[PDB]
Amino acid sequence: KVFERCELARTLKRLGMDGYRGISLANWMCLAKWESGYNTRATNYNAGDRSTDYGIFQINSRYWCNDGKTPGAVNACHLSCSALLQDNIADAVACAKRVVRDPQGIRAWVAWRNECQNRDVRQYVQGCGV
Secondary structure, eight states: OBOOHHHHHHHHHHTTOTTBTTBOHHHHHHHHHHHHSSBTTOEEEETTTTEEEETTTTEETTTTEEOSOSTTOOOTTOEEGGGGGSSOOHHHHHHHHHHHTSTTGGGGSHHHHHHTTTSOOGGGGTTSOO
8 A cells, every 4th residue: 555644654653653763753754755655565676686675664675574585684573574565564663663773773774864864854744743
């Protein structure tokens, strides 16, 4: 499913993302916008290391979820990658929280660094009443 913008902002707030380890909800919204356009079924394959990015935050198959076909798969979220392609995003949020408990924090996503870092992310939550 493709979430509406305020619909996703409220769901991420309900699920405890706002201010998780100091990361505001607007940053999480900018990350999902540039990673998937708020789409839970987005999947991007990466020819180099033969890993795939899954779901609304585009979480990678080498380090975080297991799809069974990626070399060097670490599966730090202890999640099948299929769980990141569901319309319910509770498992995608738990895994995104595990990613930012490692030292890099949200800098783990290159799209955050190249597109959200030093951009005004308040635009992403305006009018959602969150």
